[PDB]
Amino acid sequence: ACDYTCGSNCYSSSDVSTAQAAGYKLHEDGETVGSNSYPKKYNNYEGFDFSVSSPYYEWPILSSGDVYSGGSPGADRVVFNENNQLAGVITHTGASGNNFVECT
């Protein structure tokens, strides 16, 4: 089964854990990767019920299972906070322009 489903993408807890670890390390190092510069600050304008406190940061999680290294980031993102706590997994799949919907 999928622990998280973003549109047609299936993710296991292992996959979110791995993506989060990479994003958080970049966060600690003050570094970013890709043309859009990830990890970047996540603003919760959609008002998703996370039980972890802000600030929040978004990092791409890839359907391939590969850790994001540049190139196309796809539509899915792992949201983590300043204390390296997982807030959730979101996606642009099925949302107009910059809206996000939560993975199921």
Identify the three-state secondary structure at position 14: helix
Minimum distance, C-beta of residue 15 to Ca ion, in the bound complex (Å): 4
Nearer to Ca ion, 15 or 58 (CB): 15
- Check residue 76 for interaction with Ca ion (CB under 5 A): no
Nearer to Ca ion, 13 or 53 (CB): 13
Given a contact cutoff of 8 angstroms between Cβ atoms, the answer to whether 93 and 57 are in contact is no
Nearer to Ca ion, 58 or 76 (CB): 76
Give the residue, chosen from 13, 55, 64, 65, that forms a contact with Ca ion under the rule CB under 5 A: 65
- Check residue 15 for interaction with Ca ion (CB under 5 A): yes
Token pair for 21: 């670890």
If residue 84 lies in a helix (H) or strand (E), which one and from where to where?
none
Q: Which stretch binds Ca ion (CB under 5 A): 8-16, 20-28, 34-42, 80-88?
A: 8-16
Token pair for 83: 């204390």
Given a contact cutoff of 8 angstroms between Cβ atoms, the answer to whether 59 and 67 are in contact is no
Q: Which residue has the tokens 């549109």?
A: 7
Footprint on this chain of Ca ion (rule: CB under 5 A): 15, 65
